[PDB]
């Protein structure tokens, strides 16, 4: 019954989890509210200049944010209109059983 | 001890030893010439003799430039002498009041 939400942008992650939470709750029935999973973090630490200068760096980060929702009382009025919901570009979705 | 770096140039042990000979002029003042460093290099307009030397009362840091390398080495030594002598006698300048 699960929809799993992952993206590089967090403000778009609650966009997609705002609507998807609403979609199942409308077309019946129970939704396990959008759960904020812990973020997996990838740091990039790099010497600023092109040549030597080791003691000056610039810090770069990549947040793969994490969300999970459960559609509890499933009820196939839901399972259709989901295959027609508007995904913002920067997120991927996982649905399994 | 005695350290010479010849930057983007080839120099002989002869020349090296000559630098040691000139720098010796500093031994006059009878204070510890600790880990002196002579650097020789060739700008477009002439050579450069840089040097950084630590003594018990401070550091000698100076630079000579001239069409002639040997002359640049000497002009360096002058500046080194002058500074060394300022170190050694500046303390005396205020015994009254």
């Amino acid at each position: 019954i699960r929809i799993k939400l992952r993206g590089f942008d967090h403000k778009t992650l609650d966009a997609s989890a705002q609507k998807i939470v609403e979609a199942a709750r409308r077309s019946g029935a129970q939704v396990s509210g959008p759960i904020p999973l812990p973020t997996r973090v990838r740091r990039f630490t790099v010497i600023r200049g092109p040549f030597k200068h080791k003691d000056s760096r610039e810090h770069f980060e990549l947040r793969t944010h994490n969300r999970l929702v459960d559609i509890i009382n499933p009820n196939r009025k839901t399972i259709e209109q989901l295959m027609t919901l508007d995904l913002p570009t920067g997120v991927e979705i996982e649905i399994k059983t | 001890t005695m350290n010479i770096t010849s930057k983007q140039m080839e120099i002989t042990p002869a020349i090296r030893q000559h630098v040691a000979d000139r720098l010796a002029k500093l031994e006059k003042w009878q204070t510890h010439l600790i880990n002196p460093h002579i650097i020789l290099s060739k700008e477009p307009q002439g050579f450069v003799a840089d040097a950084t030397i630590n003594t018990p009362n401070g550091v000698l840091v100076a630079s000579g430039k001239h069409e002639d390398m040997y002359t640049a080495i000497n002009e360096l030594i002058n500046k080194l002498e002058r500074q060394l002598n300022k170190l050694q006698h500046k303390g005396e300048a205020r015994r009254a009041a």
Binding site: - | E92, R95, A96, A97
Partner: protein, 155 residues
């Protein structure tokens, strides 16, 4: 430093006597932030100073602190062409530190093998005016005394 007077850190009283002073002294025993070991050694010492001389660790230690507090010390000040050693009173804050520092330091100069004993013994000796920590005190105080001549040169 340059702007205003810095401020003395209030220490948290020690759980076996609630004494701001034991804490300080503990810390000065502490190498490497191994404060547990620090307290141990100290407490072990007290155990001993009870064992060997049947009276209050706390009362004893506080004396050895009182007997190692240097009252006058020398502070150097070049005037003209000589660096004169000037006599100065030591502010209680510093009296403390020096007392604790020296106490430890003499203690760690002793031949007894284990740290816990040495602290005990030095504390014992200094309550009686014996020991290195008291020697350091007097060396300092004789020094100030000789240089009584240069007292007016003070800041």
């Amino acid at each position: 430093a340059r702007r205003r007077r810095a401020e003395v850190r209030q220490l948290q009283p020690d759980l076996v006597y609630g004494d701001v002073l034991v804490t300080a002294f503990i810390n000065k025993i502490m190498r490497d932030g191994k404060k547990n070991l620090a307290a141990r050694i100290f407490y072990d010492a007290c155990k001993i100073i009870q064992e060997k001389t049947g009276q209050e660790p706390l009362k004893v230690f506080k004396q050895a602190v009182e007997n190692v507090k240097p009252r006058m010390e020398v502070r150097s000040r070049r005037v003209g062409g000589a660096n004169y050693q000037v006599p100065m009173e030591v502010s209680p804050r510093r009296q403390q530190s020096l007392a604790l520092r020296w106490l430890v330091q003499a203690a760690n100069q002793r031949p007894e093998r284990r740290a816990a004993v040495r602290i005990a013994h030095e504390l014992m000796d200094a309550a009686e005016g014996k020991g290195g920590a008291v020697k350091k005190k007097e060396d300092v105080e004789r020094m100030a005394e000789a240089n009584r001549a240069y007292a007016h040169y003070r800041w």
